[PDB]
């Protein structure tokens, strides 16, 4: 499976769509810049809309626990 | 790890397939519990950082967390370097090069170097620096792993 | 734990895994039936009071027992430093500093200082002493937990 | 969960709710003193009430084996 | 393997059954998963290719694989002889002989002779270039076997 | 459990009954005297009336091995 095809469910937590994006971003072998580009970037992107809004405004500069603990009810 | 020899010497010496193993099932086992620090603790005597990072290497699942730790390794790196900067002038031939955050985390360091640090007189403990990075970091898993 | 090498001389040697294991697997399937006590008796032999903690430590589960043997050993730590009050003047440079009950506790001191009071001519068993108050609390805890 | 969630049941024994409780403060960081102060207060607040009418009776100074030898029968 | 004895030379030791059956299981369980990489190097510490042929010729099962891995250290292999050309004239009497991609692969050349090149002076790292080879095709695999 | 509570059934064996005995005698702290005090009383008085009636005429100064074979047809 390609790292694009990687998405958030409707109902599932972003928290087990996390895992499955480092996972496969374990799987790619690609420079660490353009790693960098695709956690910012692919993440927020394919998470679902009523997280997608949340992580919206959460703003850059945002790290892991803060993203992991702004989407937990949804 | 860096053990010390029969003859009193310290030597590196390779660790065991049940040690690696004996890790893998804590983990398995006991996820993100609390008594995976005090194991971690104990199964990392006389670890070196490269050691380290094979035991973080071979790990599968819990990929966020996997995640978050590397992020902390590289945070308490940069903190490394930032409270420690580089020394002054040429390094001397006499001695051997000051480690930075990534020489720690075993990145941009040789296992001959680990081993030089370690063994040389005075020694400096390159893994317990990063072994409190991997406890606070432990910390920070916990703390959110927590339901 | 202290061991004695080859050579004649007491060294300290690091606890072997299937040994932590074999006193993890004990509270697993024993949890607090007596036979816990001779078998901790056993695979405490030569084990410092940094061992012991990184054994109670490395518990998981029965948390409540765990919480009263910890305050069992303080209570027993408190009482060992008021029946043994602190010596006259200052420390003599040709001599080492007596243990308190933190010491003894393996809180306050280091391995090293661990190592310097039990292979020191006298030596003092700071093992055999925690080793009492576990073995007290672990009465303690055989007695309330009987139903 | 957090430590303020940790409660006992209405038909629970104590016993497995303390056990509950050195779990989750096992998962607390905070300094001795704070935890103390958790410990006489928070344990047994979150009581229920057929055991903590028998802890009100027990009075301050109370050690674990009196509270869990008190609260047996409930 | 080739392991420093205690007399302090470098010496010929064979791997342990436990050993093998660890690189067995490993393969059995993760199959294709990356920590399969970390796994092997750990396990490959000190080893000879005459070695890590016995690891690749004791795979069972995922032969499609252990197909392209064969057909990429062929690969690598000729390209080895053609970096580096075969040497000016006849062979030294003094000297010892340079490998080709076959001794590398373990293939043309003995153990005698493989133990000579490592534990000469200079030393040469035949196992440490099919290592990359082996690296490099397990990473192809890693990629294709990504669904 | 405690030692006072420890009561031989009417259908079991004598055997199954002085091994739960010393289980608890086991977990019993007491002084080597009062343990002996324990034994020579409390075992027979809360044997089964059929076997209590065996034990009746073994007399005193009886043995485990002996009483152990004296009860096993009960």
């Known amino acids: 499976t390609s790292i694009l095809d990687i998405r958030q469910g409707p109902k599932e937590p972003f928290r087990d769509y996390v895992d499955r994006f480092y996972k496969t971003l374990?799987?790619?072998q690609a420079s660490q810049e353009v790693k960098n580009w695709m956690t910012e970037t692919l993440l927020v992107q394919?998470?679902?809309?009523?997280?997608?809004?949340?992580?919206?405004?959460?703003?850059?500069?945002?790290?892991?626990e803060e993203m992991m603990t702004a989407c937990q009810g949804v | 790890p860096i053990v010390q020899n029969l003859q009193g010497q310290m030597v590196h010496q390779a660790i065991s397939p049940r040690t690696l193993n004996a890790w893998?099932?804590?983990?398995?086992?006991?996820?993100?519990?609390?008594?995976?620090?005090?194991?971690?603790?104990?199964?990392?005597?006389?670890?070196?950082?490269?050691?380290?990072?094979?035991?973080?290497?071979?790990?599968?699942?819990?990929?966020?967390?996997?995640?978050?730790?590397?992020?902390?390794?590289?945070?308490?790196?940069?903190?490394?370097?930032?409270?420690?900067?580089?020394?002054?002038?040429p390094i001397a031939p006499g001695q051997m090069r000051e480690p930075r955050g990534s020489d720690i985390a075993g990145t941009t360091s040789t296992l001959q170097e680990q081993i030089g640090w370690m063994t040389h007189n005075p020694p400096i403990p390159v893994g317990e620096i990063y072994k409190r990075w991997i406890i606070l970091g432990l910390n920070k898993i916990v703390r959110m792993y927590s339901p």
């Open chain 2, 24 to 89: 893998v099932k804590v983990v398995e086992e006991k996820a993100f519990s609390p008594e995976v620090i005090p194991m971690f603790s104990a199964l990392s005597e006389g670890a070196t950082p490269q050691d380290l990072n094979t035991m973080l290497n071979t790990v599968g699942g819990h990929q966020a967390a996997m995640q978050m730790l590397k992020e902390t390794i590289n945070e308490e790196a940069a903190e490394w370097d930032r409270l420690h900067p580089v020394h002054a002038g």
């Open chain 1, 46 to 64: 394919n998470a679902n809309p009523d997280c997608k809004t949340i992580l919206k405004a959460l703003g850059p500069g945002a790290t892991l």
């Open chain 1, 26 to 28: 374990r799987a790619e």
